[model samples]
Target: AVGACVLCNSQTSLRCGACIRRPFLCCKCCYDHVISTSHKLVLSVNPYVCNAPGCDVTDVTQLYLGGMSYYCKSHKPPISFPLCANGQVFGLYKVTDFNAIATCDWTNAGDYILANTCTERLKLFAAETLKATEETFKLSYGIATVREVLSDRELHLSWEVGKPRPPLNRNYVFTGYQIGEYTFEKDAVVYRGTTTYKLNVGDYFVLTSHTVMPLSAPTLVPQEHYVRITGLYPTLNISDEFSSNVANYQKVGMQKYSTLQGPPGTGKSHFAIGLALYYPSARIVYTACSHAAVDALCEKALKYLPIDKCSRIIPARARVECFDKFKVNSTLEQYVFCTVNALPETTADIVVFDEISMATNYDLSVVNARLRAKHYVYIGDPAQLPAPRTLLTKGTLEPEYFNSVCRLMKTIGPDMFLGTCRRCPAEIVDTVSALVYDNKLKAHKDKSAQCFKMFYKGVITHDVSSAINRPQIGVVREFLTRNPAWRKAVFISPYNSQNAVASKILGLPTQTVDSSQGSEYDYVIFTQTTETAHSCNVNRFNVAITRAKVGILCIMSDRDLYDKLQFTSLEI
Candidate 1:
């Protein structure tokens, strides 16, 4: 009954030469031979047996059936198939191919027995291969393409010898599957594998990734960010005055202190406004003896505050405000301008006191008491102290108080003594220094023999403007215009009324006895035209005369008063 065998076209009783007999044979020899040989060959090669439900094929060799057109269990022709070499059925049956196989005895091959055996073997081989590969590769998940590789060159030979071979698969089948798993993308590579298996081209698999937030560049803060503002305005040739006062505060080690002292016509207040642009963190304390003084300083500062020059210095959060009108919270820190009376305790870094000589004992005492910071500076003529009357002394004052005040004055340190006088000629400075030192003012002879020229004679005149009309004035003007450059100059007088009148006429700023209160002038002109010269007025006269930068001038209206007072005979 060697009719056609269902599995193979073999008619001989032995069936196809490629088939073999087995115990699980079907009724026909064709079926029995095909199933037995295929199953045996597949199973022998695979470590795991396929236990899929209802599956008959159970060996590694059967995996090839999944890729073969005639042996496909699905009976749906695949675009491509695996090719076995030299009749070796399981040689090309890959582990992955088995996973693709359909039902047992119905995969790849047309014959049921061959299909079933091939599928079962393919599945078994796939499972076993996966396990072995995972153990050898130690694969992990979520790994991108290798950016850098690290290896021990000393152990290179060991790694080469110990490396495991890749899983088996048909030529095109393996290549096609790998292509889909490992495709390159923009910044990374996509891979495919199980949780324990990774499709990487390296000996080991380790994953490292970083996710960070990007940052931008830094920028400068605006002007409005500051909490306070300070302004300054100095007179002509007073650069050293400003420098000394500012440096005094700085030496005290306080933070955020500034200065504004420039040459004449440069606008000292304008320079001060520049600081306001940058500092908004603190308040400005402005103090001066008179309203006029405050107005002058502020007027200059305001010019820059509104212009583009000020805009450069002002921060985004800060605004310029007058000392009295500044709005601020009592409890919170704020930016504002204030008079010395309104200054906070231990808070102000900038306290500008104009015309230091006009400051009264009470005013200074209050400042010293209220301010605990180190940046305490007084700007004015130190040789002159405010009149005892302005010091709140009425009637007879105690001599001890005056002594005490004098002692305090002696303790005050001068940070800078302005040697340059633009208002007067160099001769004026020499005379004043000489008179103050009682003609003992020695000049550095080696530098210049005539360095001690007496340019401005401290002449006592009824009219201060006489400095221009007086012979002394003419001498000073001529010397200054003739010299390469002139230093600073000043005028001193015992009579406050006379100084006021004279200062106005001479076009010079008026500073009476109180003018030199906490400061020193470079040159001075003494006006002693009254009959009360030898009396207590002389005491005031000595004080005023000694305050000059050059030598003192005695403009006596009455020659008898000059002789009786012996003005020239008195020592400094």
Candidate 2:
């Protein structure tokens, strides 16, 4: 070996390959530094000494892990994963929706929540839609106003927004100010929202929504009368929902390992297939969490796409016996009826993992470790039900031993967040959005029924809520009957027991969102056995809302929910 290493005082022996921006290293460190590619090394002989014009420490030992050097780690210099610091980064962070576009500058430090506190506070109203109302502030051309009023019907207010810039979509940077006296008596409940005098610019805003309580009448009799929650939220332009994250995801996926995240109905499934199809030449490995997803992709999806260059590997479940291709009996490590786990299989290039959130830290790390491909695509929503208990026990021997790759994506960041839902109508979409996306939900004043269905959540059995599985099945059947094409709708619940009950009621097999992550149905009859808070019960609820390409009938099972009737009594 030649002179001592410049950084760690070792026998200077090797240099790194091109594209490696670092310098020379010793036998132990060179390999560590070039783990991904090859290292450019030479046998040094001039009595090890410092090469760079500086002091010489020609004598030091080494460090190791397994068989190879820790590359740039004979002394183990910090190997912290890079925390993306600049706005010139990629990731579909689901904080602000398109209705309210926020600046990338507002999220410099890793903490997105912490970055926009100042702007969020000034906009008295937090996350709600701001439409071009009768109270529009048109100060363009040659005008300016440091202080202006944007609304004055129910009260008076002016919310300021920042960037390429304000009066943009909604006063996203600012929710504004307001004041009003509202009194309502529904049945025996007294509802009043009053703030004495005019509201100042800083008053935390309060919004009261209206509702038309539909009857809890379940017609187990399919084909005619079925119940559904409708007219809650509308799907806005992607430009208005998430900074066009879908396109952003594709852009990133073209270069690095990309993760596409979003609520249901954002078309993550179509996205994976579409992207795979786009690169006709690259060998791809497309996988999902659920066998149903596998079935849909292999059985139905392939029915359309030509399979000349690509090979298909799906589950061998009873439903997939029809697919005349290679199939695996299991969904876990036994999934080698297909080969390679980043084993660097020659045929596998451009890898894709849909329903990707199901993977754990171990799972993701392993896949990422082996994936030498130029681009790896991971598609899934973190908010959905997590991995099984066998994979996720909190207070165990190794407590956070495994984290979902969703967090992994956070480090690398998401390329896109699909927001434009093609399934549910405006009403249901709005409701789900309001709770999950910090969107301002407005009441749909339509007389005729739209695609939003919330059948007074539950029927009181004892003290809490309890939905009868049989009758609920009937309700779903009735809806399906009316819309014959909607017969493809399926039931989904968080609990296995709940799924068991619903599946039996419908005479179908039980499956958690596990296999359903990438597929959509004519309708999704979602039952919430869990209690609903100010929002839906996290991922389970979020996935259900977005499953339907047409509609989702979300009903509370044994929920003591209420609806204040502002008018005469009407049937549900």
Candidate 3:
């Protein structure tokens, strides 16, 4: 039977002579060809190379080579075959047997098997070791990855978790989170963490780690709306001059301390109330010369401020007690009340002194003594005469009859004079101005028309009746009966002779010239006692002449006095 040679895949003839004569040949062929080719070749030789039938020889060199022989063809020392690259040999053997033998040798053929196998085993072992280490690290350190951030009405925060994260616990205090520079004091064992945030109304910020934390949608509180004076009175445009004056006063630590100087009927009280309304924060202390003045001012203020908010105007005589009992509302409570005396001790922002010209030197001194506030306003027309007693006593100035070189001298103080008078008609004003300044009178040119009728028409009926039967009495009687329309008027007189005339004839309570500081009437009936009385003082005459509103009925005892007060004729 022919057998296939395992080394070369050739069929061999079994001749006795051939087998004996070429014993070295068979052996040499197997040793040199099979062992060398099997170990050295890179390609697969399969079953023939393995010697065992049906053996695959998937990895021949490493599986089989122990105890294999080698022989050279041309007398080179029989080269022990199965040499690895470095030239050391190994013999062919069973797969397991070769593995066992190769493990002993550390060089050449044995080293190759050992090196290749060790490298592959090391790669697998390293992969498994790394995986185990990763798992252990993850278990020991509970570091969570940030997943989501949320915000609500009460608070703001971020959520994080790791490793089969427990159900999110909203109430749980998180670890490793921080608010501002403060960090969580708890441990890292918690599976989740939350970082609370805070936001300011109307403010924005970018959140960062080791910086400000990011904010979610943050809401702010709404502001309350309030009403101001500008909204209530839109047409009141503060003049630049007034605004600058106010600004200067504020800069110098003074505000709302001002004066309104004018004769009666100039709307001083009305203007004061308007000012109080303009500066809501100001505490206005409106003062006049007398109780009547106080009542008048208080009445005007009541008209301005809300009636429900305005306190009753306490009479000047009861001011002290009323002030003690006064309890101003906290919101609008700045002592905006009227008084007769200068409020020197008043803790008020504004002090309006009406009719200050009537204020005595003593009153002024008292005001100066108690003045704690920085601002002082003196409001009164000095040209309209001062307090009745302000001028010196006539006898006090008169020296003894023969005192050497007797002469009278008068000293005056600082005073304000108003040039503009808006109440009187232009013709009346021109006549009054000429008579006072130029010592001459001027007549209205267009006096033909009824509207331009003389101020002294039909009213100046000459009469020499007794004090009880004076013209003023007739005028008042006519006014109450015939002229019911006259609401505001003035009563003028040249001397005390007309006082009784006015009192008895008009059937009204009579006041002396000194006592008529703030009084008014309609259709003033002048009872001229003498020429000297009418032209005694130009200023006094001017004040009396301008005081009348509708018409002046002069009962002049002398024609020259009438001519002195009348206007000179002049063409336009």
Each candidate's number of clashing pairs is: 79, 43, 15
lDDT per residue as tens, model 2, 101-157:
222222122222221132322121111111111013222111111132233323333
The per-model lDDT (C-alpha) reads: 0.33, 0.39, 0.36
Candidate 1: regions farther than 4 A off: 1-250, 254-283, 292-346, 354-357, 368-374, 390-409, 415-422, 437-493, 496-526, 531-554, 557-572
Span of ten consecutive residues with least summed lDDT in model 2: 126-135
TM-score list, all predictions:
0.31, 0.44, 0.40
Task: Give lDDT: candidate 3, residue 411.
Answer: 19
Error of 1 at 354 (Å): 4.5
lDDT per residue, candidate 1, 20-111, as tens digits?
A: 21111112432223343433322122222233445554333333333322232333235523222233233221122322222122211122
Q: TM-score for model 3?
A: 0.40
Write down the RMSD of all candidates, one decimal each.
Answer: 42.9, 25.4, 50.5
lDDT of 3 by residue, 269-294 (tens): 55556555555555556665565666
* Highest-lDDT candidate: 2
Name model 3 segments beyond 4 Å from true: 1-264, 307-335, 338-344, 395-420, 432-491, 494-497, 506-515, 531-535, 557-561, 564-572
